[PDB]
Write a protein that binds this ligand. Structure first.
Ligand SMILES: O=c1cc(-c2ccccc2F)[nH]c2cc3c(cc12)OCO3
Ligand SMILES: O=c1cc(-c2ccccc2F)[nH]c2cc3c(cc12)OCO3
Ligand SMILES: *Cc1c(COP(=O)(O)O)cnc(C)c1O
Ligand SMILES: *Cc1c(COP(=O)(O)O)cnc(C)c1O
Lengths: 428, 428
């Protein structure tokens, strides 16, 4: 198929993320290649290389078509594509489970693979719910979170999504009613933790778990908070016998300046979700990890087993490429690499503070955010970043990036400058 | 890692489908290779070749390591592993969307890609809910199904699974309260459809949709029903304005002797789910298709969009291999092939009707079932099937098979023979 034919089939037959059929404001751009930090896209009918400032929705940490990850995939392909995980095990699942157990915060000893972040969240909740049924406390079934969060699109995951971010108004009467604390602030305020605890305390007899994105809230608005809030949640959850779940689907694998964002605070959740960057952007795969205590309680309970099992659980191809992606990350000085990226993002985005439409500029590891005072019009900003050789996708009032780790100082410069310019055109 | 090392790691760190940690009665077998219809498994230190009678949980329709599917994957690997589907489109997605629209029941014109069956089911339910919100009937929010069904493990998916099979209590005050018709009989009885209509009639104003597995109920108990009920379901849904959803995640791509099980009845659902065999069992991928009318109403609704967007939506690698998998199926005389497999399963399984422990023997397309009078002990069944060079995995009281389509007559006969012998051992 040609790019013109792709557009036509696409417009008649393809849904896209949170999109329409036949009523699309803009119109998707055809991608034809991706290599390293660059995509090849079709503009005015011509191929152009542009920087993947978004890491293809936070996935491409090592860049596209990284030779070590292509080979990991090809090697596995020639030997064993997939076998069912029911009754069978295999080397890629074992290898990856060992890495994950070793590199995640202390005490996360068991791994349940699934096919996506949303599913890993539902698995996490199911772990929490079965845990308490195992302990003889079935009333502990509600979830608690703070506002501003995002956890995925499946119905249970939607229930702990920010009520505005996740559009709860469209869903009156259909979602579980969960317990929401106020928005977690940027700077550390012990009074917020105290208020969080008081709210939790009166619900504890009915809460299975607190579920949060640690340090960085992504799709709910790219807000950062002081790691010390996570230390306080760990302490609150411990004292009131409520499980603590960290969703590190966006934050995991170095993105925020630490291996896992949990690490900034030096704290272990009881249950953890990872995804997005796990396969270095090659294939869909996710994992939920839980402590030995959670694992044994579930296993010694009435049901005798965790009641879940995706068809493609522990797929050998995804697992093989993830092992390579993780080892590649661990085999380099990733901490310096992120520090440099962060400096690059700070330096390049500094001039945007002055802009008339800009309310905030903030950076956390390989994450750079320009917050505006109004919705960023994509029909303006998209062609504007393409013109400068950058793939950028603003969302709501934010002009932001999660650049691949392999980006050079010159590439970051190029990214930040495109971002600064999108912010300027918003003010005019 | 060695086989022994894998077991050691697996027993300590890996969850399996519907399994425990530390309380596993049987212990998983190590798989080291898969080619065509054969797995290489490690039995007592030694490698053996066994027929994949289960098709790796109903996925490997073309066998493993098929050269056309291998190629399609490596070809796409060197070009473009993945890009975000937000704002972008690509050839693998448009080719596959085009195919899916062309070969599925008529009127199914739009395609939403996602990573797994359970997710595609939650997407289907979301389309139904938003459709009726588009029409000003937000009261239409419940789902109706008949008993014995299975739809996945995520929380909405769970709510329409059989209330005994899915252990709905266990899940007391957590699942949405859905409407359940009695188990659909094998043989056609018009009294059943009349009772279904009468039950639907009294919930019509609160029903978004009817959701069923057409013709074959999979994980709920390998039950077959007369395609004519689907015709009745279509008629009832039309007259009462309740959307019809077919979960074809197990049944699709020729498995029941028709391309899609809906074809046995000539019926078009409003919304359809596929997965499992979609990629020929290489990678995880599912799809939810809906009619133009459904797409336009959601798009014209208050929301202006379908509020869903998985990270790895429409992953190029996964789509490219699906394209090649669908093309490979459509390019051969698949109907004759499936008729041949069915005839071979029928002939090979006949002798089991006489066995003292067998209550039924049924076949439908490339699905063969020995229904036993007691639950089947895997600790006896699994080694027995291995001894005969077959990978069989019984479920509850079923010794069943869904072999790859590339299985020769002799391989089918080896499969059925191992099934008979397992059924014989159950009777003692
Ligand atoms: O043995 C399995 C049983 C189930 C299952 C259990 C209870 C209810 C429904 C199910 F599909 N689900 C399964 C799902 C699997 C699998 C095995 C199983 O390997 C590939 O993915
Ligand atoms: O643009 C996207 C927006 C959302 C989204 C929308 C509303 C609320 C939360 C979200 F993550 N989710 C998305 C998920 C995507 C994606 C794009 C988007 O490309 C690959 O996966
Ligand atoms: C993206 C995301 C999810 C959902 O991931 P999918 O693979 O899109 O289902 C869940 N949690 C967090 C924090 C995320 O950023
Ligand atoms: C296997 C199956 C599902 C769920 O598939 P996953 O990929 O395991 O989420 C849903 N519906 C039916 C009918 C199935 O057979």
């Amino acid at each position: 198929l040609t790019p013109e034919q792709i557009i036509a089939v696409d417009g008649a037959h393809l849904w896209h993320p949170y999109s329409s059929i036949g009523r699309e404001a803009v119109s998707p751009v055809v991608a034809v290649a991706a290599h390293g930090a660059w995509l090849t896209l079709i503009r005015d009918g011509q191929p152009i290389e542009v920087l993947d400032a978004m890491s293809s929705w936070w996935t491409a940490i090592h860049g596209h078509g990284h030779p070590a990850l292509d080979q990991a995939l090809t090697t596995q392909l020639r030997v064993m594509n997939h076998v069912m995980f029911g009754g069978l095990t295999h080397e890629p699942a074992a290898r990856l489970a060992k890495l994950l157990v070793d590199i995640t915060p202390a005490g996360l000893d068991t791994v349940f693979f699934s096919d996506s972040g949303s599913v890993s969240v539902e698995v996490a909740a199911k772990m929490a719910l079965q845990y308490w049924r195992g302990r003889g406390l079935p009333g502990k079934r509600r979830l608690m979170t703070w506002r501003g969060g995002y956890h995925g699109d499946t119905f249970l995951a939607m229930s702990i999504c920010d009520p505005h971010g996740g559009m709860h108004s469209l869903w009156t009467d259909v979602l579980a009613a969960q317990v929401f604390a106020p928005q977690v602030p940027r700077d550390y305020d012990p009074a917020y933790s105290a208020a969080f605890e008081a709210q939790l305390a009166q619900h504890a007899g009915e809460l299975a778990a607190v579920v949060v994105e640690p340090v960085v809230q992504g799709a709910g608005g790219m807000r950062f908070h002081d790691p010390r809030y996570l230390h306080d949640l760990r302490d609150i959850c411990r004292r009131y016998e409520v499980l603590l779940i960290f969703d590190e689907i966006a934050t995991g694998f170095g993105r925020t300046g630490a291996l896992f964002a949990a690490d900034h605070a030096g704290v272990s959740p009881d249950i953890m979700c990872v995804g997005k960057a796990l396969t270095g952007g090659y294939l869909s795969l996710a994992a939920t990890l839980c402590t030995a205590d959670v694992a044994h309680t579930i296993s010694a309970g009435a049901a005798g087993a965790l009641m879940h099992g995706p068809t493609f659980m522990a797929n050998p191809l995804a697992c093989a490429v993830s092992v390579a992606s993780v080892e590649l990350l661990l085999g380099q000085d990733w901490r310096t690499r992120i520090t440099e990226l962060a400096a690059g993002l700070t330096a390049g985005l500094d001039t945007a503070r002055a802009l008339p439409a800009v309310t905030d500029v903030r950076v956390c590891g390989a994450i750079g955010v320009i917050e505006c005072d109004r919705p960023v019009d994509l029909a303006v900003a998209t062609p504007a970043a393409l013109d400068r050789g950058v793939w950028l996708r603003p969302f709501r009032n934010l002009v932001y990036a999660m650049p691949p780790y392999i980006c050079t100082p010159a590439e970051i410069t190029q990214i930040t400058s495109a971002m600064v310019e999108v912010a300027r055109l918003v003010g005019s």
